[PDB]
mmCIF file with all atom_site columns, C-alpha atoms in Angstrom:
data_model
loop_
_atom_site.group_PDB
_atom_site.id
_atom_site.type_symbol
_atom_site.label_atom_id
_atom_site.label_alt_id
_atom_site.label_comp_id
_atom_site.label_asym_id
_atom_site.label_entity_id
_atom_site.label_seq_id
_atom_site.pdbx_PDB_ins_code
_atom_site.Cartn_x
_atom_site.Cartn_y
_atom_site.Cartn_z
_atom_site.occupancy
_atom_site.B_iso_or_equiv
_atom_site.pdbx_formal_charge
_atom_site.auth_seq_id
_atom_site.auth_comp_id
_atom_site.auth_asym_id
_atom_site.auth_atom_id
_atom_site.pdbx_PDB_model_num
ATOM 1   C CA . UNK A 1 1   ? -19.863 26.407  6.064   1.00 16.12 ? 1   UNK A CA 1
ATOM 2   C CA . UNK A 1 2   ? -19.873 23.370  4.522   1.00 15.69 ? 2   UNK A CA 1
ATOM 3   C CA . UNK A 1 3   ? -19.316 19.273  4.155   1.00 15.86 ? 3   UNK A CA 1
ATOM 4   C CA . UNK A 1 4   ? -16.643 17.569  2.342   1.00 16.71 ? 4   UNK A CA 1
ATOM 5   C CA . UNK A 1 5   ? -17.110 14.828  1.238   1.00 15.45 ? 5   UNK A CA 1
ATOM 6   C CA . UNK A 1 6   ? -14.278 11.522  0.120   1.00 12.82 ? 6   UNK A CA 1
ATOM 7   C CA . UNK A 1 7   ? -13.995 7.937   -1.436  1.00 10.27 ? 7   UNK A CA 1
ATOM 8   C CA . UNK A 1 8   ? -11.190 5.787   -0.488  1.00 11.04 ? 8   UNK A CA 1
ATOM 9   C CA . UNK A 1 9   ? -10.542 2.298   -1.434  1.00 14.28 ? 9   UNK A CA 1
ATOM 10  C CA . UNK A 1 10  ? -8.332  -0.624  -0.033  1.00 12.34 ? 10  UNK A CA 1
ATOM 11  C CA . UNK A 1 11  ? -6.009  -0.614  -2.756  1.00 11.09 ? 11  UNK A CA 1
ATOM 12  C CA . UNK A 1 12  ? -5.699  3.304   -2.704  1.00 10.08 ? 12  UNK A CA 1
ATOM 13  C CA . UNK A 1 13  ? -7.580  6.713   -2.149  1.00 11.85 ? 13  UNK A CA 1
ATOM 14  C CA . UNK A 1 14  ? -10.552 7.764   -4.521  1.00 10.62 ? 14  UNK A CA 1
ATOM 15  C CA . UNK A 1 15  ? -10.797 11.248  -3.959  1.00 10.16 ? 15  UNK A CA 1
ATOM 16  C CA . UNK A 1 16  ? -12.129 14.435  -1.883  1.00 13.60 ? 16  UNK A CA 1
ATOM 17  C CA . UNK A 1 17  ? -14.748 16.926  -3.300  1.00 14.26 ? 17  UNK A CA 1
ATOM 18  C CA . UNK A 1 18  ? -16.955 19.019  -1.645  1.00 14.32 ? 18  UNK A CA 1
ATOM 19  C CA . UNK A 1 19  ? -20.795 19.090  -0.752  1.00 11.15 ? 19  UNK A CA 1
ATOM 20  C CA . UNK A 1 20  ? -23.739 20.580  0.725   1.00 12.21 ? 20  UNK A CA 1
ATOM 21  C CA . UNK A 1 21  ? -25.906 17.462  1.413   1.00 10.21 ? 21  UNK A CA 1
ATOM 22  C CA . UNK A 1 22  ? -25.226 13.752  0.825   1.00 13.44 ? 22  UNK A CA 1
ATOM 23  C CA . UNK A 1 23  ? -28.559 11.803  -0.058  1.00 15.17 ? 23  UNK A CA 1
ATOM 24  C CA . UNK A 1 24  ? -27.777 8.006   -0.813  1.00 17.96 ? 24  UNK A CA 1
ATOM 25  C CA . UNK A 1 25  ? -29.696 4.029   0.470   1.00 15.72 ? 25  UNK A CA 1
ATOM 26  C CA . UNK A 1 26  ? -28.320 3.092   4.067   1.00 15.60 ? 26  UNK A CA 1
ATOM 27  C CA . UNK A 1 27  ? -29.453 0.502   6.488   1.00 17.80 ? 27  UNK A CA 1
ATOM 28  C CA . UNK A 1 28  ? -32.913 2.046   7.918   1.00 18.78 ? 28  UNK A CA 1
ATOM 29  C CA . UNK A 1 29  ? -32.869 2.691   4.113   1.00 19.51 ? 29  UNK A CA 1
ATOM 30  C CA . UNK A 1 30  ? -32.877 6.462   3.858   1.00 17.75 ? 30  UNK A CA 1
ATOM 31  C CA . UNK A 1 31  ? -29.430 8.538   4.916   1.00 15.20 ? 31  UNK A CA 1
ATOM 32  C CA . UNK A 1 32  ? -28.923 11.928  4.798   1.00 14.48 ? 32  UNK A CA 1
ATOM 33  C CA . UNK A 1 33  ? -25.827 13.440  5.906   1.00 12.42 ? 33  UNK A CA 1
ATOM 34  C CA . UNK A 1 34  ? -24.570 17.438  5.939   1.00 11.42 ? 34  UNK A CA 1
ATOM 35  C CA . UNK A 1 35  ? -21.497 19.594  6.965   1.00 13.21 ? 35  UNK A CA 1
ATOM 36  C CA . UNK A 1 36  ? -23.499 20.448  10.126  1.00 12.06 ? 36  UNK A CA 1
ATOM 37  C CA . UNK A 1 37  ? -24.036 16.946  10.564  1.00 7.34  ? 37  UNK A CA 1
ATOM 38  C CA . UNK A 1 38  ? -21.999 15.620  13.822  1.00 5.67  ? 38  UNK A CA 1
ATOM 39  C CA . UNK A 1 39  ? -19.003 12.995  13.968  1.00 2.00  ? 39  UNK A CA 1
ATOM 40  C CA . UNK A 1 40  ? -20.707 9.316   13.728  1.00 2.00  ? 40  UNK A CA 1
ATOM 41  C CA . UNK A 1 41  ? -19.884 6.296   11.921  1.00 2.00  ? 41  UNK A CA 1
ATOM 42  C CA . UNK A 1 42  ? -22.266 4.444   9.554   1.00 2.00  ? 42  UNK A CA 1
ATOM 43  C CA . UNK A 1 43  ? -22.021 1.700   7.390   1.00 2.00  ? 43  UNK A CA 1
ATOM 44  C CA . UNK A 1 44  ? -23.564 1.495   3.656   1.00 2.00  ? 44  UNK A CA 1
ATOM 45  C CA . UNK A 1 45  ? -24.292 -1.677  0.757   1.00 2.00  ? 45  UNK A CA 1
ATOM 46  C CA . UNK A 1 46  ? -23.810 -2.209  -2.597  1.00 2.00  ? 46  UNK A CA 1
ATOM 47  C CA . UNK A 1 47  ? -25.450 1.311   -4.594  1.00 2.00  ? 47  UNK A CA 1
ATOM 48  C CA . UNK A 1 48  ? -25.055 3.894   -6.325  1.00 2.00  ? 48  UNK A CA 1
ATOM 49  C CA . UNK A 1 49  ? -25.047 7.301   -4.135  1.00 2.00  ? 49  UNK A CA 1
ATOM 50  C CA . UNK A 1 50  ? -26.154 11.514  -5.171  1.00 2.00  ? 50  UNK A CA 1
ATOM 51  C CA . UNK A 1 51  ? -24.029 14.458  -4.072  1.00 2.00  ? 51  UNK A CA 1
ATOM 52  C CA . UNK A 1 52  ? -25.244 17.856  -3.876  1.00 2.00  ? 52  UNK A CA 1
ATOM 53  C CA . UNK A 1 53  ? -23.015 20.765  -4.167  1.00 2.00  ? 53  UNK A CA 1
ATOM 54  C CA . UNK A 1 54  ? -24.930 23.230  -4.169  1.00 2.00  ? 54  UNK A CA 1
ATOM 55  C CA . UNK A 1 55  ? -27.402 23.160  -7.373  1.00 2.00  ? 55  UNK A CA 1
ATOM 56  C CA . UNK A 1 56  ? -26.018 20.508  -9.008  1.00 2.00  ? 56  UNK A CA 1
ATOM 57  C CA . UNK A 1 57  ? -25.574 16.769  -8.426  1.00 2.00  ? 57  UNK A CA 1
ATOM 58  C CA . UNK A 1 58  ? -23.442 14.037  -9.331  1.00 2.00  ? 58  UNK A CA 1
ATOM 59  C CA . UNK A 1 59  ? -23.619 10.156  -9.336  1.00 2.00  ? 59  UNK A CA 1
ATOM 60  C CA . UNK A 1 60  ? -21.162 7.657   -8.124  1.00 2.00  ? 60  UNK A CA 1
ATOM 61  C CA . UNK A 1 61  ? -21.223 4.166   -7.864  1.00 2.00  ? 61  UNK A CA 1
ATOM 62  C CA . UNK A 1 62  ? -20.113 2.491   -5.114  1.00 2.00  ? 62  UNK A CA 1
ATOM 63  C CA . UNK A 1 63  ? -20.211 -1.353  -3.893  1.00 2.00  ? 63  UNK A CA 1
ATOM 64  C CA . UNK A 1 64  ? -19.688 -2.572  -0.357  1.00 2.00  ? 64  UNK A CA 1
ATOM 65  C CA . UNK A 1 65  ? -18.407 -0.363  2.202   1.00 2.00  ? 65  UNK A CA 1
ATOM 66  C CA . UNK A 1 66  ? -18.140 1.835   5.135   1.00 2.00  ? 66  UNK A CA 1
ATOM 67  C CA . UNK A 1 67  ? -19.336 5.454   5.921   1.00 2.00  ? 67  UNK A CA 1
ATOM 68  C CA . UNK A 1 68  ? -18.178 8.214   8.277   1.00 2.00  ? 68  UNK A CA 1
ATOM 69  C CA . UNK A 1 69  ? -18.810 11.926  8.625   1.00 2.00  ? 69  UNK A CA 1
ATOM 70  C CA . UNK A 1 70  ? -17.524 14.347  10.770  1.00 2.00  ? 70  UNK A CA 1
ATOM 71  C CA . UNK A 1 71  ? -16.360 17.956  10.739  1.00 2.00  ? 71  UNK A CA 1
ATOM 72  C CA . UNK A 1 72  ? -17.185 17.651  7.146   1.00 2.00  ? 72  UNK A CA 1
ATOM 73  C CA . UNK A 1 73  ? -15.438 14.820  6.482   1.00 2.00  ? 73  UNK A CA 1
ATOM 74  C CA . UNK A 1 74  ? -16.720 11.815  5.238   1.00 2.00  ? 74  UNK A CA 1
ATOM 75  C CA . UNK A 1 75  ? -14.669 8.417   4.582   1.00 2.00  ? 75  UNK A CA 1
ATOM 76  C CA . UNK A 1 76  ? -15.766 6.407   2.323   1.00 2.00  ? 76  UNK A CA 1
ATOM 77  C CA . UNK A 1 77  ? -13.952 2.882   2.956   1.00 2.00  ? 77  UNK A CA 1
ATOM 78  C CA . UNK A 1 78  ? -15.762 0.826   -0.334  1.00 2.00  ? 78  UNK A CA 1
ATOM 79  C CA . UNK A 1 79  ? -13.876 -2.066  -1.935  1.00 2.00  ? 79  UNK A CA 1
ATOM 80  C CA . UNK A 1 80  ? -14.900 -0.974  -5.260  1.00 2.00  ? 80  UNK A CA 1
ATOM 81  C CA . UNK A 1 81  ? -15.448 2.753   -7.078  1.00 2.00  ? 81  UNK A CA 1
ATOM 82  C CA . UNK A 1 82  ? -17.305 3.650   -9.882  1.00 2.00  ? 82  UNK A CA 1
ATOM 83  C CA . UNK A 1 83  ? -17.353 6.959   -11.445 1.00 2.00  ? 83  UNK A CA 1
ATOM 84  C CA . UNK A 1 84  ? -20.539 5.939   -13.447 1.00 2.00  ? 84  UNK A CA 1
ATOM 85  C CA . UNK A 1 85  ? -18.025 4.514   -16.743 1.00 2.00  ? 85  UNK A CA 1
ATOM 86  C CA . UNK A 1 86  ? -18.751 1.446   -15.325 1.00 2.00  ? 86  UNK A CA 1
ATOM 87  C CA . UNK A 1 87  ? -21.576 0.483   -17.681 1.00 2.00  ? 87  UNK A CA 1
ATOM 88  C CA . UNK A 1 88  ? -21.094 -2.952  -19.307 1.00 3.12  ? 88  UNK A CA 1
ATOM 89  C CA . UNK A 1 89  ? -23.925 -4.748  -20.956 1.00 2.00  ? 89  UNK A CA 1
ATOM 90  C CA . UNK A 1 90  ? -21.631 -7.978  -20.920 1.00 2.00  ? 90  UNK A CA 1
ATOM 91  C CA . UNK A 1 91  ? -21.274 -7.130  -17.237 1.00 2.00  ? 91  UNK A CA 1
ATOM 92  C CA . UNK A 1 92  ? -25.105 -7.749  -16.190 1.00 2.00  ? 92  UNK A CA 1
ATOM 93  C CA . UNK A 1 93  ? -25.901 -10.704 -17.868 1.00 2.00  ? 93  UNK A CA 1
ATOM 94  C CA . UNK A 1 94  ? -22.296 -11.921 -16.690 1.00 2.00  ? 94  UNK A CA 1
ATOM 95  C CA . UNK A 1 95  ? -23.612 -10.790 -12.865 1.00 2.00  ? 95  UNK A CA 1
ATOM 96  C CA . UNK A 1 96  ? -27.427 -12.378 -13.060 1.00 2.00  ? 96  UNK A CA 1
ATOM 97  C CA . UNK A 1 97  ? -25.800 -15.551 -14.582 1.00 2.00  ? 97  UNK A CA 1
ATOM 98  C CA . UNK A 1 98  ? -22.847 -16.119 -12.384 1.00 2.00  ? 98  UNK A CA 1
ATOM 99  C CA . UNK A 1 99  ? -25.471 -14.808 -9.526  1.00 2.00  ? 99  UNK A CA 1
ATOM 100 C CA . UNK A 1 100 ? -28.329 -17.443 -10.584 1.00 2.00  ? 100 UNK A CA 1
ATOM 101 C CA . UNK A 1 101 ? -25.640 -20.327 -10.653 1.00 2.00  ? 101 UNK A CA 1
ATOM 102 C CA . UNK A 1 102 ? -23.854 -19.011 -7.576  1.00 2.00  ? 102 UNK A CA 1
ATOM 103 C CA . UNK A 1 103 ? -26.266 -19.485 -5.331  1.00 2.00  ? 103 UNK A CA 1
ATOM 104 C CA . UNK A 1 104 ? -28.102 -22.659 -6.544  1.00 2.00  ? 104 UNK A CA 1
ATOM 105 C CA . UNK A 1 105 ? -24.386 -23.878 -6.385  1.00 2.00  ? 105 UNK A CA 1
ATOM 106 C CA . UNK A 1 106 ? -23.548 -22.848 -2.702  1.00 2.61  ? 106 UNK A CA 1
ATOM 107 C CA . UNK A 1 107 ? -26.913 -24.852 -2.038  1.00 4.83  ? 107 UNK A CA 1
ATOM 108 C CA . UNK A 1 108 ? -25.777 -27.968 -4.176  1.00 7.57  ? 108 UNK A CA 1
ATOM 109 C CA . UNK A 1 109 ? -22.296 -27.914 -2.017  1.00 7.67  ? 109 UNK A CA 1
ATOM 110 C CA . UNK A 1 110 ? -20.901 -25.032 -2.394  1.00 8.90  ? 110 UNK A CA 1
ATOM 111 C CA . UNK A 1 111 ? -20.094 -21.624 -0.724  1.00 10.21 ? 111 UNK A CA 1
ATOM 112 C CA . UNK A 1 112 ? -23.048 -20.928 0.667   1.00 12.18 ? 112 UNK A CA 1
ATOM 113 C CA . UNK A 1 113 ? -21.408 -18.071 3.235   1.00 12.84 ? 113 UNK A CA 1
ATOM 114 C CA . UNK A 1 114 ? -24.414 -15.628 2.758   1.00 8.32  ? 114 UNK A CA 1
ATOM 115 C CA . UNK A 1 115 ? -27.261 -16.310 0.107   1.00 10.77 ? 115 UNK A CA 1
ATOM 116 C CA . UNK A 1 116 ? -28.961 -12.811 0.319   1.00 8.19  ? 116 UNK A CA 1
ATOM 117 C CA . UNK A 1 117 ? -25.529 -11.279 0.490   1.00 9.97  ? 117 UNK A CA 1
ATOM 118 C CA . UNK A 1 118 ? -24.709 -12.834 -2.496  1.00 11.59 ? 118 UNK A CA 1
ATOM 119 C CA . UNK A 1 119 ? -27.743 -12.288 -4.301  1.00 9.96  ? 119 UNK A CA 1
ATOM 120 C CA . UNK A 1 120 ? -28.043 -9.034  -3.069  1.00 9.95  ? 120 UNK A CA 1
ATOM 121 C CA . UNK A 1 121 ? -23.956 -8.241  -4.097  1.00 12.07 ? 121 UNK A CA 1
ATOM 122 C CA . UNK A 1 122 ? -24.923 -9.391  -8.199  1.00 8.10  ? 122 UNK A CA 1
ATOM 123 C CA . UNK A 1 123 ? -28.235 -7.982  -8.526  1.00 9.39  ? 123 UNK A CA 1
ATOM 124 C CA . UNK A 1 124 ? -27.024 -4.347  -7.039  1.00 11.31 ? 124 UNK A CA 1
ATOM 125 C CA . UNK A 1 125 ? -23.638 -4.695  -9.201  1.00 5.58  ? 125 UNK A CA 1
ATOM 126 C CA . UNK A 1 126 ? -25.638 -5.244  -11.724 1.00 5.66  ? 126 UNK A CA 1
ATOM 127 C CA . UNK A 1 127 ? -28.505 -2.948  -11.447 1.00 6.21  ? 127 UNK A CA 1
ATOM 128 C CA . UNK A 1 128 ? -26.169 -0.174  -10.639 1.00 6.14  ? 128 UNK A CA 1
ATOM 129 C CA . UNK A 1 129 ? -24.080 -1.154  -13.538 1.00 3.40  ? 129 UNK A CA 1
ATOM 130 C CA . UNK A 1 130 ? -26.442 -0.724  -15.972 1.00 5.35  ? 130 UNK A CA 1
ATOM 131 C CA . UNK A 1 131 ? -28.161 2.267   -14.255 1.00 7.21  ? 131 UNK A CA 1
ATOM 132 C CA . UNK A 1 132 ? -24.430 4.079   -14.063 1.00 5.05  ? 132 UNK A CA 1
ATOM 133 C CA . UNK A 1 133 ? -25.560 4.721   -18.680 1.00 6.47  ? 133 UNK A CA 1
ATOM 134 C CA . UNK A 1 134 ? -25.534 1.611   -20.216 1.00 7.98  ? 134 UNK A CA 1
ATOM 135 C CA . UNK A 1 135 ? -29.167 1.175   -21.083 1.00 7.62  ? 135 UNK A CA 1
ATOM 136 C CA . UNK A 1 136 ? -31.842 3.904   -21.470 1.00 7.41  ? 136 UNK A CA 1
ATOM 137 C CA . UNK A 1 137 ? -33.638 2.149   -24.080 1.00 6.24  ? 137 UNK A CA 1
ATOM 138 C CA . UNK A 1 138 ? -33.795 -0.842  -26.443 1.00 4.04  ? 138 UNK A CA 1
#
């Protein structure tokens, strides 16, 4: 009747709630999963992600990580969780810097594994950060 929905982290398990529809930034960069919805596996980037229950939403942020529905159930394998009390001003100009010196440092001789990973890892953190409530307006 309907899809249900779950976080779960390396380090533990998030939670389980329920939803109608699951609307959220994947890969081909639009992913919309329901309870109908069959048993496939996914995988998902650094963002924030909207839940709808029914008429209401709610927004979670989550980094890194893997997604699977099916039979309702969707896992949620991210490395990091964020119930949107994640906002930290210190946080993005901490993430833009460390980003900015990062990767002209992995090019000077350092760990240069994956530039637009990297970039792409800092500027979501920290858009999403600051997006979660921690600046609506100067």
């Amino acid at each position: 009747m309907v899809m249900t929905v779950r976080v779960i982290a390396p380090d533990k398990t998030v939670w389980d709630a329920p939803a109608e529809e699951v609307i959220l930034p994947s890969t081909t960069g639009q992913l919309g999963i329901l309870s109908n919805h069959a048993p496939l596996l996914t995988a998902l980037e650094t963002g924030v992600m909207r839940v709808r229950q029914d008429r209401e939403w709610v927004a979670i942020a989550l980094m890194g990580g893997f997604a699977e529905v099916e039979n309702n159930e969707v896992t949620i394998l991210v490395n990091g969780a964020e119930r949107g009390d994640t906002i930290d001003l210190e946080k993005a100009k901490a993430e833009f810097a460390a980003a900015q010196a990062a990767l002209a440092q992995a090019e000077q001789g350092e760990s240069k594994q994956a530039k637009i990973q990297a970039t792409q890892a800092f500027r979501r953190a920290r858009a999403r950060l600051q997006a979660a409530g921690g600046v609506v307006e100067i």
